[PDB]
Design a protein around this ligand. Sequence first.
Ligand SMILES: O=C(O)[C@H]1O[C@@H](O)[C@H](O)[C@@H](O)[C@@H]1O[C@H]1O[C@H](COS(=O)(=O)O)[C@@H](O[C@@H]2O[C@H](C(=O)O)[C@@H](O[C@H]3O[C@H](CO)[C@@H](O)[C@H](O)[C@H]3NS(=O)(=O)O)[C@H](O)[C@H]2O)[C@H](O)[C@H]1NS(=O)(=O)O
Ligand code: NAG
Ligand code: NAG
Ligand code: NAG
Ligand code: CL
Lengths: 74, 385
Amino acid sequence: QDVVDLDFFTQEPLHLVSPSFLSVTIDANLATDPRFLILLGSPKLRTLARGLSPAYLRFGGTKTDFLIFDPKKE
Amino acid sequence: KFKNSTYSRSSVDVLYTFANCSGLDLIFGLNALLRTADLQWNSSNAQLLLDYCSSKGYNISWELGNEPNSFLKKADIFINGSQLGEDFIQLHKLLRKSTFKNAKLYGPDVGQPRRKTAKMLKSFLKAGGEVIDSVTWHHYYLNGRTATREDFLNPDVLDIFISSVQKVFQVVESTRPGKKVWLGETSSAYGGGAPLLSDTFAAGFMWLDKLGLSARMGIEVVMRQVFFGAGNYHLVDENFDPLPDYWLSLLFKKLVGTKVLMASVQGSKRRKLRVYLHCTNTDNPRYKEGDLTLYAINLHNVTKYLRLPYPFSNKQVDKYLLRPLGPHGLLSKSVQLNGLTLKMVDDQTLPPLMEKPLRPGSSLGLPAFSYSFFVIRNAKVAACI
Ligand SMILES: O=C(O)[C@H]1O[C@@H](O)[C@H](O)[C@@H](O)[C@@H]1O[C@H]1O[C@H](COS(=O)(=O)O)[C@@H](O[C@@H]2O[C@H](C(=O)O)[C@@H](O[C@H]3O[C@H](CO)[C@@H](O)[C@H](O)[C@H]3NS(=O)(=O)O)[C@H](O)[C@H]2O)[C@H](O)[C@H]1NS(=O)(=O)O
Ligand SMILES: *[C@@H]1O[C@H](CO)[C@@H](O)[C@H](O)[C@H]1NC(C)=O
Ligand SMILES: *[C@@H]1O[C@H](CO)[C@@H](O)[C@H](O)[C@H]1NC(C)=O
Ligand SMILES: *[C@@H]1O[C@H](CO)[C@@H](O)[C@H](O)[C@H]1NC(C)=O
Ligand SMILES: [Cl-]
């Protein structure tokens, strides 16, 4: 027999997750790719991203602590 | 290996406009290794970034540091959790004095809670826990370099996540009771992912189980490494093609609600048949208040047939069963939903996610090495309304 009975607890929420429970990252590493602007400009990629709305987009990773803001750079 | 690099106003602009246009809330990690004469955080570069983001009206949330537990290994600098706590207090003062004075702050983005990591998280939350809106920590199951196919299918590997979650809540409950806990960066395997594994249908077992356990155990937010990038663990490849975990994520987003319930299997052999139960997402136009979303993983090598308990036995159920497109089986980069390949209609259009109505009273079929969502229509669960 490969038949299996489920038991459910339904009397109240055991937890509440954020509406953004399933979120995503972009690694700090990607901002060193010469093609950063082309890549995140892709409207195909933005279509895919919008499907996971609402969500956080966390920009971070090992490179977080090796990245310096330069107001002069182009 | 780790050299200092600069980024431009342009880069910031690329990042923010991607998030804004995509309907996502940007969290930006600040450089924690900018240190004064006596290893205090030097906030002067962050001040430049905060001013500029303010001057553009960018609503951004902040982190400071990534995996501070390995700063010694990465940069030969040791920062204890007390000092890191003081560093977050200083960043919080700068946010309060900024144009966005309610801006959220998350940290400390530690690794999984090994003894030395648990000590650093405890001393961090004692010193700086008052100013963070959520505690962030990171989890990977495996080293991408050594991970095997069998690991990705192994309940013994899936279950290690449970004790990592238990140790995090033990540190938080002993220092900042009730503070929200987030997975700030997580995936199958580190080193950029396991080749031909982390980007396949097989990656789905680890990803759906982690979501099910996180929701069940009290984690509020899970951040997937990565949406897009070099690593095999990307949801989308560099050719902008979605991998099976993108489609899995999109179904989860559309079907799974915020209210977490519980399912378990009688005979209590919770190893290879893994089940999770939430209220249905009410943003889903097809469904209504009171509906349930069951999701199930079958790591058996045979079909299992699931029977719903009373009073749900004879409800209309919508099946959303994911199987790989051949010929690469579990190592495929293409997935079918109820026998139809998931593919974008064009660069601007996601496809419909078509359900399979099951005949009421029927057992829920779950093939070997598969995962499925099941929506129980007209469940009328008061907890869900
Ligand atoms: O996945 C991780 O390990 C993540 O770990 C967390 O702790 C960090 O928070 C997160 O940032 C990490 O992901 C990102 O960094 C990874 C580590 O990079 S590091 O430079 O080793 O420090 C990175 O993984 C590396 O990716 C390298 C790459 O170039 O893509 C890999 O490099 C190998 O392959 C290329 C050709 O494919 C070759 O030209 C390289 O010389 C070769 N080096 S090798 O290791 O000797 O083989 C490297 O294998 C790998 O460790 C992640 O890719 C990155 N995340 S991202 O989304 O891809 O940016
Ligand atoms: C902080 O960094 C700036 C810019 O790199 C530097 O000029 C300044 O002297 C540093 N401040 C302290 C207190 O060390
Ligand atoms: C943490 O580091 C700071 C700065 O290096 C130091 O002055 C302090 O004594 C350390 N705290 C503990 C508890 O070891
Ligand atoms: C499933 O695994 C068992 C245990 O090794 C094996 O002997 C059996 O024949 C397998 N069945 C199928 C259908 O592959
Ligand atoms: Cl919801």
